[PDB]
Each structure stands twice: as structure tokens, then as C-alpha cells.
Structure 1
Amino acid sequence: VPVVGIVAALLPEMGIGFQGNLPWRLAKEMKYFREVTTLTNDNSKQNVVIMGRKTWESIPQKFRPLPKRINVVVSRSFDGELRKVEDGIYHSNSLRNCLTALQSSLANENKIERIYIIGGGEIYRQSMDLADHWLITKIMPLPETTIPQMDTFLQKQELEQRFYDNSDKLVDFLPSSIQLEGRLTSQEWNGELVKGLPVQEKGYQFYFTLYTKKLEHHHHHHHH
């Protein structure tokens, strides 16, 4: 089961939140996030969404737990490494231990396709060492638009050490049933190269991107 971090960030600093909320409201960004985390290649499988305690608390109480997805809320105050508390809601007290629990094919019985880390920021930092892929929505304010104030940021440094821009394989990576508008485009913005599928809403133009783990040198395999 692949571990995939999914996030929406504003370039160049990659800001993700402000005072417990999203610094923007974009219908086409939500539509993408919902479909990616919901849809699967195996019709009898469901994905898992993992979030920190604070991210859970800001999701509209009408729309949580997130429908058609197994929800996992991680807080250090909780009891076990994975615990069912309500219908489709799981409580965990360790992000690392939670991942190991779902990955063991005894517990899941091969009914989980992907583990999406919907994150938080404290979770996102810990996800750099954990996630295989990253689905990053690179958002740019249009020439007239004002940059919104933000207090939570994605580690752009830790990301570009361990991951490369694999946006060429985005359509292949996303579930087959998903619908996409534009086509793969490269674009320079404030220095850096922005590559992905271009969408425009309100005063923002954003790109859906894919970041895969870089190739590892074979240093040591655990022999018995």
C-alpha cells in the first residue's frame, strides 16, 4: 500500500494554512482532492485518509468524517496505535505505528489501495521521511491578486532533497476514473520551474504536480 502525501501550497514559500484554516477557498481544488482520495482502481477497495488532531477540528462538522474514505485522526493523547471509535473514524497515537498497522496485509486484507496523508503541517514534516509520493497543488496568485497571510508552511527543502518532479506520470498515477481538464504544461514562476496540469479559479492559477522519491544507492540490505 503506497503512502502518498496530498497537499495544496502557495508558491514560492509553500504556505498551506492560516489560523487553523485554509488561506483560500477553491471549488476546483476541493473537487480534485475529493476525487483523488475517494476514487480507486480496485472498485472493492477504499483509500485511507490520515490527519493530525488540529486538521480534523477545522473540517466542517457536516462533512466529517470524509465520506467513502477510512478516516484516521492521530493525537498523542489517544490510547492505541489504531482504534475504532465511531463508524469510519479511527483514533491513533502514533503516525509511524499507524502506518505499520495498516500496511500489514493481515489487518487490511488487501482492501486498502492507498494511504493518503491529508496532513496538517506537523504531520506533513513527519511525512517527508514516510511518504513515497507527493501530490502537490502548486498555487500562484495572478498579477492583480493579493497574497493571503499564512502561518503554516510545507518544508520545500526536505521535499526537494528526497523527491523529484515526476509530474510527467501524473495521469498514470491518478485513479483511471478521474476527469482532468488541461494538459501537461511547463511554466517558470519567480525563478522555479512549475510543471503539471494547469487550472484557474478566482484570482489563482494552480498546477497539480507529482513528486516521487529519488533513487537510492544500495548501501545495505538486511541479511539474516
Structure 2
Amino acid sequence: MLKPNVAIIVAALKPALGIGYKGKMPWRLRKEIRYFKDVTTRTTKPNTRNAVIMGRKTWESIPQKFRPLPDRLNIILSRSYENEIIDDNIIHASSIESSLNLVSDVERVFIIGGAEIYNELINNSLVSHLLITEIEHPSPESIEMDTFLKFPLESWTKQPKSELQKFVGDTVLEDDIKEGDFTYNYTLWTRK
């Protein structure tokens, strides 16, 4: 049985693993936006592309002129949708199982959020990598939030930086990136 190559990509504030407040991210991290773009857009060969899968709320939080996310197939989930290919760049899917059946033309698949989607996928056997941007701040409790990852990190193994570099290819991975009061690092995890 052929299966797609799927990873979760997310940015979280430690230690609680907070992901959002209201319907947005509690930070604006310049370099992290760029990493996100590169990682999700990069392919091993030209004239190929990846897909991104998101929840309706995340699609909606993207300003209209900036959607779909360029250079990648965008897949949007809503329990109100009918499976439908809108154009070459946008597909509507009515369940996770269908979403994973609509990625036949891409190289890699990235689950890009939000909370409910992440929580639904982390226990799917198809997900073989977690790409976590671990964020730190002097006083995390000062950062307001209502959305958290509920991942069983004990059943995942954080890999050495070398393994991440293997996955991201040519992208530069700086350590301990500072922006304002935040410090962060990109990480890669595999299943135990």
C-alpha cells in the first residue's frame, strides 16, 4: 500500500506548549516565518511541490490576498465541505481520511494547524515527523493563551540537529535565535 510522507509543523511556547490566543499566534517571529515558508515549499527536484493541510479556522485567519499559500497545494478541512478541487492550488476536503487521499501529486505533506487538526493527527500512523519550533521567554506566564498542543512527547524522540539538516536540505538553521524577548530553536522528532 503506498502512503504519503507526512509531517506536522508547529511553533509552541514552552513549557506548556501554547500555540495560540483567540485565533492568532501570540508572537510575530520574523525568521520563523521564513523557515516555515522554505521548509514547506522546498522539494528535492524542480517542477514538483508539497501540500499543506489546515483547518478552516486557520485558512480564514489568512488575509484573503495572501491565500492560497503560494507554491504549495492547499487543502482545507471543514465538516461542511464536500470533497472538491476548486483550482490547481486549492482543494476542499470533508474529513481527514479524504485529505490524505487528495495528495497523489505531491512530494511531502505538511499538517500546518490549528489546534484541533494537530490534535486529531498526532496519533495517525501516517505522521512520521514532528517539526517543532520550541520557543522560550523569560516569563511565559505573561504571554496570554487558550490553545495548546496535547502531544505525547514521551512517545517521540527529539533527533540530533544533523537529522533536521538532512530533512531541510540547504536551509540554514541558526541556534538560539533571539527576537525581542523570545529565544527559539527548530527541532525534529520521530516516533518511539
TM-score by length of 2: 0.90
Once residues 72 and 61 of structure 1 are traced to their aligned partners in structure 2, the CA distance between those partners, rounded to angstroms, is 16
Larger radius of gyration: 1
Equivalent residue for 2:130?
134
Q: Which moved more, 1:36-45 or 1:15-24?
A: 36-45
Alignment of 1:1-224 (within 5 A): 1-80=4-83, 83-102=84-103, 107-108=104-105, 112-130=106-124, 131-142=127-138, 147-156=142-151, 158-161=152-155, 163-168=156-161, 169-174=163-168, 176-180=169-173, 182=174, 197-214=175-192
Give the percent of matched residue pairs that are identical in Structure 1 and Structure 2.
Answer: 44
Taking only aligned residues, the RMSD between alpha carbons, in angstroms, comes to 1.6
Runs of 4 or more off by more than 3 Å in structure 1? none
Distance apart, 1:87 and its partner CA: 4.6
Task: Report the alpha carbon displacement of residue 69 of structure 1 after superposing the two structures with TM.
Answer: 0.8
**Would you say the 8 A contact 1:39–1:178 is kept in 2?**
no
- Residue identity matched to 2:159: N
What SS does the corresponding residue of 1:132 show, helix, strand or coil? strand
AA partner of residue 141 (structure 1): H
Deviation at 1:213, TM superposition (A): 1.4
CA contact (8 A) 2:50 2:110 kept: yes
CA displacement, residues 100-136 of structure 1 (integer Å, 9 cap, x when unaligned): 342xxxx42xxx1110000101000111112110000
State how far apart, in whole Å, the 2-side matches of 1:100 and 1:213 are.
23
Q: If the length of structure 1 is used for normalisation, what is the TM-score?
A: 0.78
User: Aligned letter for 2:93?
Assistant: S
The code of the aligned residue for 2:123 comes to D
Give the Cα–Cα distance (whole angstroms) in 2 for the partners of residues 146 and 98 of structure 1. 36
Whether the 8 Å CA contact 1:128–1:159 is kept in 2: the answer is no
Return the offset for 1:146.
Answer: 6.7
Name the SS for the 1:42 alignment partner: coil
Q: Distance in 1 between matches of 2:91 and 2:153?
A: 28
Aligned length: 186
Q: Aligned partner of 1:85: which letter?
A: I
Q: What CA distance in whole angstroms lies between the structure 2 residues aligned with 1:68 and 1:101? A: 17
Query: Is contact 1:141-1:147 (8 Å) kept?
Result: no
CA apart distance, 1:41:
1.3
Gaps of 5+ in 1: 183-196, 215-224
